[PDB]
């Protein structure tokens, strides 16, 4: 069997090939404890500390999956624009230290298109770390148009904490619970202004603290997800998910943009906000030319799509030639990845 | 084995790719025959692929391998029709060649086959101190400022090949990652990834009858023909007149022509054959042979390093385009 | 066509100038089979690329700002208000007529758009006469010359205006 | 020019002995002057300086700064935002507090000087 290790920004999703649900999702935070829930190795999608990523991968193979990595070929997920070298230290560790029989590296997003069932388009990937919009023509991204937004849920959960403390409810300590609020209550509007005017206290949902103290959130329900579309809230000048998708679709060829516009697939747990589809429908249908046909696609299983897109690849009889064998590695080195994994 | 029994299922394979892919099959099944493979390397560079498609298919009878191979290739070869618009393994092989062609001018550090031409191109309107780039710098000057046109035009009037260009509708600029490989996304080995430039989009009017791109369909993307090569000649004609008395001139001229050849394929202005199909012209060849210059137009002896880098490239574009389409089945068999 | 050119920069303001516009619509402009592809191949004879968009207004009246369905649908809709039984025929007897249907290519399209909207099993046939410009008239000539129609007329003594409902259709 | 009083704090906010206290004191001047209705804020933050709640008030200040970023500038908010996370205090080198308090006492004295009947102390004897 094969193993699929999506070392993500906040959670690592692992499982096997053929399956349809990560059999193990654990926070990637590292004599050493690298717990499922108990510093951060991958900061913004690029692995800053490698001596502690060995560990995320130790818990992955030996403790969460109880699998000896010596016998399973390993699929791995990189991020768009991994610094080239960081690809190199992924071929190294897996064969030199983990002695795997084989390996493959893929972009976290093409893989999301394959789970939306397509292989030509633009993907918007959000996560607890970087949010990137990645244009992919024919399975391979266009690296000159992959755009990066350094906004994610972390920044966003912390914004909710400000806005509720200001309301009156304070969360001083590590967790005095706002993530639950972020994904159980918050939504994205079509028009922030309409929803801000709505005197009604009807857009208020209430929840229980541990002890039974129920607090109420409203207004904040739709501002948190908006930091994404108007990040000046948080002190930023990068313009938002809506237009970043266009700015890229516009640094590409006139000839391929008909396809990219009709295939904008949302991925990431930062898109599980209800309403992130139609806002961007509004906001890209406006900026786009008027003769364009559009379909923003949000598959319902977007939380673990990068992984799902990996099972698919590994469930393919034809993906058995695309594995970097160790035999090959010993000769060239960690630079076979640039020659076999594009 | 099955791999190539799949990479030869590209509904987008062109003649160029077959050659690379098929020698790969032989190089691992067979393993002496290496000379044949070299011929296969030369015919490809010189674009006599046909001979080569035949020769691989004839060599699929001498050494009879696995019947997969023998029986496989023969059914795909005739359908192969080359496109100078989507020929890409040739772009990697051509853009990577100029790198080798230039490693060898770096080993001709005389760089003084260039000082004399300076004062010979300061006649059509700091010698080699920096190396090569100074000469890539002024090579352009030569052709672009010697004249936009109007001195090269009499030579062009003497040509019956220049009138046959096929270029057209400005389409725009596109920001790519390797120069000859105008295609932005061609899976690029990160071994060869350049800074993100902004590259032009050139368009082809196939309606100019007998257009170059119909005639030599193999040479990729050569909508036009090098117009400023004719004006390389004016500058070259003086040198030969002034320095015909130089003894080693074939070495020194070939140190210029070969550089134009490489830089043009290296910076993306043209392709081998667009620069070369002008130099192999009658009234232009006459100039050289009156001073006994026999030119070697960028044909090198180690063609191997580039060759493999191509077979493997075609291994990457195709297989992952073969799963690309297998997904396009398993989902259209879900929907 | 006026507005569209109005912004491609040519200006046809005067009355005589308006006739120029009519002249162009009448001929050069056409109905496109795949609008969208053709507004992407995009990227009196002063030339314009507003050739496929003018008649796309018939198919989608949104350009104009009209809230109504394309002639493609006014047709289907009308059809489904017809007995299921006679639909087979209506589908197989659809005739384009009138002058504005003289735009080249409305036919193949009418076929497509309706076809996909239509029962996956019915028979769709569009019949376009080249004389559609004047087809109404020709139609009437035949009749007036039909021997039998001669009594379907109204006598002056029969007139001796509510006979228009009861002797005529 | 006034842009030398602004640079001055862009440059005063970069010293290696700056702490939690000095920030609150310089910022207000910066807000009181970058702007020119917001009277309460310099009193709300004030009350907190006497109570040593530099912690919350730094943050409230840097909430006002953003909310009123309109009448302020990109530069002030940028700088101010960078310096705060990295703040600590050292009793030995917390000396602005000391002036305040030294000057405060003389203030509490006139007050007591304005409080006439001093018989209260006599009875304490």
Subunit organisation of the chains:
part of a larger assembly
Q: What is the structural class of chain A? A: alpha/beta
State the helical fraction of chain A.
25-40%
In total, how many beta strands of chain A?
A: 16
Per DSSP, the total helix count of chain B is 14
* Main sheet: strand order of chain B: 1-2
Instruction: Profile the largest sheet of chain B.
Output: 2 strands, antiparallel
Write the element-wise H/E pattern of chain A from the N-terminal end onward. EEEEEHEHEHEEEEHHHEEHHHEHEHEHH
Order of helices and strands of chain B: HHHHHHHHEEHHHHHH
Cα distance spanning the termini of chain A: 23 Å
Shape of chain A from CA axes?
Answer: globular
Which structural class do you get from the secondary structure elements of chain B? mainly alpha
Strand order of the largest sheet of chain A: 3-2-1-6-7-16
- What percent of the residues of chain B sit in helical stretches (DSSP H or I)? 40-55%
Task: Report the biggest beta sheet of chain A as strand number plus sense, adding barrel if it closes.
Answer: 6 strands, mixed
CA gyration radius of chain A, whole angstroms:
21 Å
């Amino acid at each position: 069997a094969a193993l699929v290790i999506d070392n993500g920004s906040g959670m690592c999703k692992a499982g096997f090939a053929g399956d349809d649900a990560p059999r193990a999702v654990f926070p990637s935070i590292v004599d050493s404890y690298v717990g499922d829930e108990a510093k951060y190795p991958i900061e913004h999608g690029i692995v800053t500390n490698w001596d502690d990523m060995e560990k995320i991968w130790h818990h992955t193979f030996y403790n969460e999956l109880r699998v000896a990595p010596e016998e399973h070929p390993v699929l791995l997920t990189e991020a768009p624009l991994n610094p080239k070298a960081n690809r190199e230290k992924m071929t190294q560790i897996m064969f030199e230290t983990f002695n795997t029989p084989a390996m493959y590296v893929a972009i976290q997003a093409v893989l999301s298109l394959y789970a939306s069932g397509r292989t030509t388009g633009i993907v918007m990937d959000s996560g607890d770390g970087v949010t990137h919009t990645v244009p992919i023509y024919e399975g391979y991204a266009l690296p000159h148009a992959i755009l990066r937004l350094d906004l994610a849920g972390r920044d966003l959960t912390d914004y909710l904490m400000k806005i509720l403390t200001e309301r009156g409810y304070s969360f001083t300590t590590t967790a005095e619970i706002v993530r639950d609020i972020k994904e159980k209550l918050c939504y994205v509007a079509l028009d922030f202004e309409q929803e801000m005017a709505t005197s009604s206290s009807s857009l208020e949902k209430s929840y229980e603290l541990p002890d039974g103290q129920v607090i109420t959130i409203g207004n904040e329900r739709f501002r948190c997800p908006e930091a994404l579309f108007q990040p000046s809230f948080l002190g930023m000048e990068s313009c938002g998910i809506h237009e970043t998708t266009f700015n890229s679709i516009m640094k590409c060829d006139v000839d391929i943009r008909k396809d990219l516009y009709a295939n904008t697939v949302l991925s990431g747990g930062t898109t599980m906000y209800p309403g992130i589809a139609d806002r961007m429908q509004k906001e890209i249908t406006a900026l786009a030319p008027s003769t364009m046909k559009i379909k923003i696609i949000a598959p319902p299983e977007r939380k673990y799509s990068v992984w799902i897109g990996g099972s698919i690849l590994a469930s393919l009889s034809t993906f058995q030639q695309m594995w970097i064998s160790k035999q090959e590695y010993d000769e060239s080195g960690p630079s076979i990845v640039h020659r076999k994994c594009f | 084995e099955l791999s190539i029994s799949l990479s030869l299922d590209s509904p987008k394979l062109d003649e160029s790719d077959f050659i690379l892919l098929s020698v790969k099959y032989l190089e691992k099944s067979l393993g002496e025959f290496s000379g044949f493979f070299e011929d296969i390397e030369k015919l490809y560079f010189k674009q006599n692929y046909k001979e080569a498609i035949e020769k691989i298919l004839d060599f699929c009878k001498k050494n009879e391998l696995s019947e997969q191979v023998v029986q496989r290739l023969a059914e795909v070869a005739p359908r192969l029709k080359s496109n100078p618009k989507d020929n890409e393994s040739r772009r990697l092989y051509e853009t990577l060649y100029a790198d080798h062609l230039e490693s060898v001018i770096k080993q001709e550090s005389d760089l003084s086959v260039f000082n004399e031409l300076r004062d010979s191109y300061n006649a059509v309107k700091t010698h080699e101190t920096e190396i090569k780039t100074l000469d890539e710098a002024k090579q352009f000057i030569l052709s672009f400022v010697m004249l936009n046109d109007n001195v090269e035009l009499p030579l062009k009037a003497q040509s019956e090949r220049y009138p046959k260009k096929d270029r057209s509708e400005e389409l725009g600029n596109t920001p790519s990652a390797n120069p000859g490989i105008m295609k932005p996304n061609s899976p690029n080995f990160t071994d060869n990834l350049v800074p993100v430039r902004d590259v032009p989009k050139i368009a082809i009017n196939e309606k100019v009858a007998g257009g170059y791109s119909k005639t030599k369909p193999t040479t990729p993307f050569v909508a036009s023909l090098s117009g400023t090569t004719y004006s390389l000649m004016v500058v070259l004609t003086d040198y030969i007149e002034k320095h015909k008395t130089d003894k080693d001139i074939e070495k020194k001229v070939n140190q210029i022509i070969n550089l134009w050849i490489s830089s043009y394929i290296k910076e993306g202005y043209h392709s081998y054959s667009e620069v070369v199909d002008v130099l192999t012209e009658p009234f232009l060849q006459s100039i050289f042979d009156k001073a006994n210059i026999k030119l070697n137009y960028g044909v090198l002896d180690d063609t191997h390093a580039e060759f493999r880098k191509a077979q493997d490239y075609v291994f990457g574009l195709t297989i992952q385009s073969a799963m690309h389409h297998e997904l396009q089945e398993r989902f259209k068999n879900k929907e | 066509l006026m507005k569209i050119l109005t912004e491609r920069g040519y200006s046809f303001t005067t009355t005589a100038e308006r006739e120029i516009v009519r002249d162009i619509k009448e001929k050069l402009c056409y109905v496109a089979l795949d609008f969208e592809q053709e507004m992407a191949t995009a990227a009196v004879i002063t030339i314009g690329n507003e050739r496929f968009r003018c008649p796309e207004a018939l198919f989608q009246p949104s350009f104009l700002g009209m809230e109504s369905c394309g002639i493609h649908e006014t047709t289907f809709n009308s059809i489904m208000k017809c007995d299921v039984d006679i639909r087979k025929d209506l589908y197989a007897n659809t005739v384009l007529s009138g002058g504005t249907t003289m735009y080249p290519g409305i036919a193949d399209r009418m076929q497509k758009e309706i076809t996909a909207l239509a029962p996956s099993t019915m028979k769709i046939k569009i019949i376009a006469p080249p004389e559609r410009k004047y087809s109404v008239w020709i139609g009437g000539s035949i009749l007036a010359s039909l021997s039998t129609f001669q009594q379907m007329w109204i006598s002056k003594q029969e007139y001796d205006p509510s006979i228009v409902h009861r002797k005529c259709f | 020019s006034y842009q030398k009083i602004e640079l001055s704090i862009s440059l005063s906010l970069d010293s290696p002995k700056l702490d939690e206290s000095d920030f609150i004191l310089l910022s207000v001047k910066y807000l009181e002057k970058s702007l020119g209705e917001f009277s309460g804020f310099f009193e709300d933050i004030e009350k907190l300086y006497f109570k040593q709640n530099y912690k919350e008030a730094i943050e409230k200040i840097l909430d006002f700064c953003k909310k009123n970023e309109s009448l302020l500038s990109e530069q002030v908010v940028q700088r101010l935002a960078e310096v705060a996370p990295r703040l600590k205090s050292n009793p030995k080198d917390n000396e602005s507090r000391r002036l305040y308090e030294t000057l405060y006492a003389d203030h509490l004295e006139s007050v007591i000087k304005q409080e006439s009947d001093l018989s209260v102390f006599n009875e304490l004897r």
